[PDB]
Amino acid sequence: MQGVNIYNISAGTSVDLAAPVTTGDIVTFFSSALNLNAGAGNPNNTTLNLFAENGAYLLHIAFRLQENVIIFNSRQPDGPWLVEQRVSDVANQFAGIDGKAMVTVFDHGDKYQVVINEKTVIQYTKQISGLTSSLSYNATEETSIFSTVVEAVTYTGLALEHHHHH
Amino acid sequence: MQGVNIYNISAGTSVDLAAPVTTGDIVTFFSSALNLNAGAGNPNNTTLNLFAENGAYLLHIAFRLQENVIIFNSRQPDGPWLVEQRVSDVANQFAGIDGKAMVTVFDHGDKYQVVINEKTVIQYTKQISGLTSSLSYNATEETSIFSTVVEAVTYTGLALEHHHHHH
Ligand SMILES: CC(=O)N[C@H]1[C@@H](O[C@H](C)[C@H](N)C(=O)O)O[C@H](CO)[C@H](O)[C@@H]1O[C@@H]1O[C@H](CO)[C@H](O)[C@H](O)[C@H]1O
Ligand SMILES: CC(=O)N[C@H]1[C@@H](O[C@H](C)[C@H](N)C(=O)O)O[C@H](CO)[C@H](O)[C@@H]1O[C@@H]1O[C@H](CO)[C@H](O)[C@H](O)[C@H]1O
């Protein structure tokens, strides 16, 4: 069954999903603010995470104003960060909309399509696979590029099994 | 391919979609306000609409506070309104979330699933089929249950099917 779930996530906290996100599903983070002059991160200004049941970081999205780049990576909870993917020019990805922003993640099975507002920033080839069962938004009150509380909206149960009888 | 399009629809206006909404696609209307004391509609307080290229109301969602009901219907541009599907108790459908609201419509090909926030309020069997080429949000600042501007976000190019054959 297709469904919509809404989660208010405060900076520095995580949430367990009522319905997991799998291939064909969508997850969008909504920020009621956009602070592109928040100062240097430590090293990250803001991070958004998709966790698998086992605790693995399936997708780690990190924004760094001082390096002017958006990082995408994965890792096991007790392991080292894997191969970092980078996309430069943070402001250009949010260009067109001020005072708010949205980050959408499409789970395509083999890759994660990340879209900031209307722009696809990267087709991220997965380094770790599995179902997303938890989300987190990490940042300090002072240096986050997003609002203190971000709202995560998930669209699940989207893929359909179509049986054909001959 | 999959894409996100954002539209900011002021009350009483409509917008053409850059990417049409078809089977497997999703549209969510976001309101920064929830005015359950907006007063009397005439008879509608607010309407959210998915239009076909010929102007047909593929899906008409009308919120009525005084009649305490959310109506779902369809009709051709030059045709009469068809069979209404009703959901009583407007407030109850939005319960749990205050100061704002979210209305999502899934185009499942044969039906339209309408969800208010996290609550699926109806699996509306289509009365008219076709792709959605435009959307509208109609109301007056005076009696709308939503904010003056409603943000509509469409997720398109979504369709994902796994085919299974038997003989
Ligand atoms: C402090 C710092 O700049 N750490 C980043 C840096 O780490 C190198 C390898 C070294 N350990 C150090 O300088 O401390 O460079 C790596 C990439 O080579 C990485 O960006 C380090 O930041 C970490 O990045 C991961 C995601 O890849 C997470 O964002 C961590 O929170 C972050 O510390
Ligand atoms: C004016 C009005 O409230 N009309 C609604 C009412 O019509 C009855 C039959 C009668 N003509 C009248 O009281 O004026 O009841 C019908 C359903 O029986 C319907 O809700 C009428 O409202 C119309 O509903 C359609 C959707 O079905 C649209 O919302 C129209 O804008 C609206 O006028």
UniProtKB/Swiss-Prot annotation, chain A:
- Which GO molecular-function terms appear in the entry? DNA nuclease activity; polysaccharide binding
- Self-association state and partner proteins as the record states: Homodimer.
- Matches recorded under InterPro entries: ConA-like_dom_sf (IPR013320), Galectin_CRD (IPR001079)
Give one Pfam hit by family name.
Gal-bind_lectin
Mark the residues carrying the PTM Blocked amino end (Gln).
2
**Do you know which SMART domains this protein is assigned to?**
GLECT (SM00276)
Q: Which residues bind N-acetyl-alpha-neuraminyl-(2->3)-beta-D-galactosyl-(1->4)-beta-D-glucose?
A: 44, 60, 64, 73, 75, 81, 84
**What name does the UniProt record give this protein?**
Anti-tumor lectin
**SUPFAM superfamilies for the chain:** Concanavalin A-like lectins/glucanases (SSF49899)
Keywords of the record? Apoptosis, Hydrolase, Lectin, Nuclease
What this protein is reported to do is described as:
Anti-tumor lectin with DNase activity. Inhibits the growth of several tumor cell lines in vitro. Induces lymphocyte infiltration and necrosis of tumor cells in a mouse tumor model. Induces apoptosis in HeLa cells. Binds N-acetylneuraminyl lactose (N-acetyl-alpha-neuraminyl-(2->3)-beta-D-galactosyl-(1->4)-beta-D-glucose).
Species of origin: Cyclocybe aegerita
Q: Which Gene3D superfamilies match?
A: 2.60.120.200
Q: Which residues form the Galectin domain?
A: 13-156
State the superkingdom: Eukaryota
Q: Could you tell me in which tissues this protein is expressed?
A: Detected in the fruiting body.
PROSITE patterns cross-referenced by the UniProt entry: GALECTIN
The enzyme's E.C. designation: 3.1.21.-
Gene Ontology terms describing biological process:
apoptotic process; positive regulation of apoptotic process
